[PDB]
Amino acid sequence: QRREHMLKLEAEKKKLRTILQVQYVLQNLTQEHVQKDFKGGLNGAVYLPSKELDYLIKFSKLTCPERNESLSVEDQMEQSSLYFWDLLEGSEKAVVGTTYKHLKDLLSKLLNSGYFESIPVP
Amino acid sequence: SPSQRREHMLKLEAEKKKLRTILQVQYVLQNLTQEHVQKDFKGGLNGAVYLPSKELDYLIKFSKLTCPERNESLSVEDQMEQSSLYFWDLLEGSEKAVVGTTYKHLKDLLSKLLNSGYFESIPVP
Incomplete structure (x- = not known):
């Protein structure tokens, strides 16, 4: 039986779906115009206190970094993948001035919103 | 218990x-969506490994599935479900049919591209 x-x-x-989804959200938080919307509560963005949003912005640069040719593509994906893993693990381990646990809670607010369902263009 | 824990x-x-392997494959396929990278692979112009025209075409088609453009008829969650499955079945490498070939064949081709080192430093247009 195959159940x-x-x-x-x-x-x-x-x-894997939740990870790619979290990636979709953070990759968009890397964008300047999306950040301003969250900073002013614009265009259906859910309200976040300024420091709370800053955690998500700092964390997005780790999960969705720009290329570092000092590392092999494999070693940089390894670095990036661990940030996604530890986020979903939601441990009390410290990262970017907060915890993986807290970031996971914040990301659930963002995933559950509808701001990202249709993203406004610059 | 130490057998439970190891x-x-x-x-x-x-x-x-x-997960790391998925992100690597994602990095490669996302880059194959680009026109200038495709021109490199059609030839041998910047360290691109040789691929026959139909085999490279398989990768270009598959990349649009793994790295699709937004479809607002689907929720982001529902589009990530479709998209993620292409990554999963690629790693599974079964004989199942996709884009005019198989997941197994695509996995072998994608292993050549990862191993080529073309993607270590991408040339600018």
Whole structure:
């Protein structure tokens, strides 16, 4: 019977989905125009206190960094992948002046919003 | 318990490795969406490895699935479900049909491109 292994695989696919989704949100927070919207509460952006939004901006540069040719593509993806992993783990480990746990909570606010469903163009 | 904990230590390492591999494949495919990179691969112009015209065409088509443009008919969550599955089945490398070839064949081609070192430093237009 093929029911048990498929449930675990269904969950593993789901985590990958959540990761790519978190990536989609943060990659957009890298953009200057999106940041201003959150800074002023514009265009359906959910309200965040200024320091809370700053955590997400600093963290996005780690998950979605610009290329560093000092590292191999493999070593930089390894660095980036760990940030996604530890975010979803949501441990109390410190990162960017806060915790992976706190960032995960904030990202759930952002995923649950509708600002990213249709993103405004500059 | 130390057999409970070593086995568990091994699975996390395997999961972290797979996620890294996904991001690498994503970096490659996302870059193949670009016109100028495609011209390099059609020839041998900047260290691009040789690929026959149909095989490279498989990669270009597959990249639009893994790295699609936004479809507002679907929620972001629902478009990430479709998109993520292309990454999963690629790593699975089964004989299942996709884009006029198989996931297994695409995985082999993608391993050539990762190993080519073309992507270590990407040339600017």
